[PDB]
Amino acid sequence: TIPGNFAAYHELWRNAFQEIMNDPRHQLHRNDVEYKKIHAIRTVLDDYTKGGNTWWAKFRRIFTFHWNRHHVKVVDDIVKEIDAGNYTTSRALVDRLDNLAISLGSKLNPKGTLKEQIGFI
């Protein structure tokens, strides 16, 4: 099935991402130092923003979806946040990923409202 909004694309992405990070080829353990976890996640996210050829081939279908372009832009900003040293635990990094599709407020009226604000129109 085809995700019909950005949050639905992100849910599919989340399911992929956890499958990828749980791959035994990462050789990560719960008691690994946090830097090692963050770096493995960074690697996988970077691969995602470059077309997904190393870690995301099984999910190649998601790169054709409409939402991919903007989702890749957001994940690219997160990779930059990693590079800038914003994450000291992998737990915080995955909370960021978890919640990247939500936002505060609600849709702005893209149209002007002059005709609504004049009573007789």
Signed CA dihedral, 8, 71, 36, 85: sign only:
negative
The answer to whether 9 and 71 have CB atoms below 8 angstroms apart is: yes
Strand ranges for 66-114 from DSSP E:
none
The answer to whether 75 and 63 have CB atoms below 8 angstroms apart is: no
Range of the domain at 56: 1-121
- Judged by DSSP in three states, 65 sits in coil
The answer to whether 44 and 21 have CB atoms below 8 angstroms apart is: yes
Technique of determination: X-ray
In angstroms, the CA 8 to CA 102 distance is 11
In angstroms, the CA 30 to CA 37 distance is 9
In angstroms, the CA 7 to CA 103 distance is 10
Rg of the Cα trace of the chain? 19
Per-residue exposure over 68-106, b if at least 16 CB sit within 10 Å of its own CB, e if not: beebbebbeebbeebeeeebeebeebbeebeebbeeeee
**How many domains does the chain contain in total?**
1
Q: What is the resolution of this structure in A?
A: 1.9
